[PDB]
């Protein structure tokens, strides 16, 4: 099930002493409170500045057991996007009144959200798939 969905607008792409990973600052286009900080593998999914990415956070992909490499005949929620990660939430922080930051770690590639209403669906789970299109 989808826990979060928005269209973000990349402002800054910073390499910063790395060869494969960039740090991505992205503000949203629907609300005015949610910013996005994200590390992506820029060798696999190249991002330039002033790009418009469709960031989705899902809970699973559309009764399985564990990860197993795909075959002919699979059918998943990842079939829509271009770049899927999988990580954990490790920190909640209320930035002010009516702002909540959630922090994600994708194996060491970090993500920080912001905004207010997401007590509805973002949780402290050990599992969140994260999907960027286009």
């Amino acid at each position: 099930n989808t826990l979060f969905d928005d269209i973000f607008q990349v402002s800054e792409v910073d390499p910063g002493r790395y060869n494969k990973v960039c740090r991505i600052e992205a503000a949203s286009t629907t609300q005015d409170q949610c910013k996005l900080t994200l590390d992506i593998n820029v060798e696999l999914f190249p991002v330039a500045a002033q790009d418009s990415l469709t960031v989705t956070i899902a809970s699973s992909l559309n009764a399985t057991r564990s990860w197993r490499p795909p075959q002919a005949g699979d059918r998943s929620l990842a079939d829509d996007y271009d770049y899927v990660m999988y990580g954990t939430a490790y920190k909640f922080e209320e930035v002010s009144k009516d702002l909540i930051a959630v922090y994600y770690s994708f194996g060491g590639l970090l993500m920080r959200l912001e905004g207010n209403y997401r007590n509805l669906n973002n949780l402290k789970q050990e599992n969140a798939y994260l999907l960027i299109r286009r």
Partner: protein, 147 residues
């Protein structure tokens, strides 16, 4: 030594596992030394990405179930942190897997907030690779050092 009274003392009282902390001030005296320090700054880095044949080879290169390293008799692994464009594992996710296989199964993972020796400015803008975070036995942040 030449009898079972002296074998039992050299395995339970004078063994190297009970000499981890020194009695002088309670500090640890055992740990890895030169190339292993300078490999953890490369392996637990953020550029370190490994494919499935690389990931599974590094886990069995260090952990043999035949020598009794595992606590499960079967090497368990983790899902990759990048699914779609090519399935890839991360070098911190290898440190997570080897703690998963050698620590006993019926306990919770380790929870630890420590630091490195390496300042955040050496990694670029906005990095948090000086805070070391273990959460339920998963290395989520920071490289690993002599510290």
């Amino acid at each position: 030594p030449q009898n079972e009274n002296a074998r039992a003392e050299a395995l339970n009282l004078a063994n190297t596992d009970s000499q981890y902390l020194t009695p002088t001030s309670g500090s640890p005296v055992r740990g890895l030394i030169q190339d292993h320090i300078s490999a953890g700054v490369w392996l637990t880095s953020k550029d370190s990405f490994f494919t499935r044949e690389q990931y599974q080879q590094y886990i069995y290169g260090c952990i043999r179930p035949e020598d009794g390293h595992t606590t499960r008799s079967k090497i368990v692994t983790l899902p990759p942190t990048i699914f779609k464009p090519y399935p890839l594992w991360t070098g911190k996710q290898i440190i997570t897997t080897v703690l998963l296989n050698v620590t006993p199964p019926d306990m919770p993972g380790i929870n630890l907030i420590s630091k490195n020796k390496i300042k955040n400015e050496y990694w670029g803008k906005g990095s948090l690779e000086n805070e070391v975070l273990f959460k339920d036995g998963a290395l989520l942040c920071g490289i690993l050092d002599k510290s």
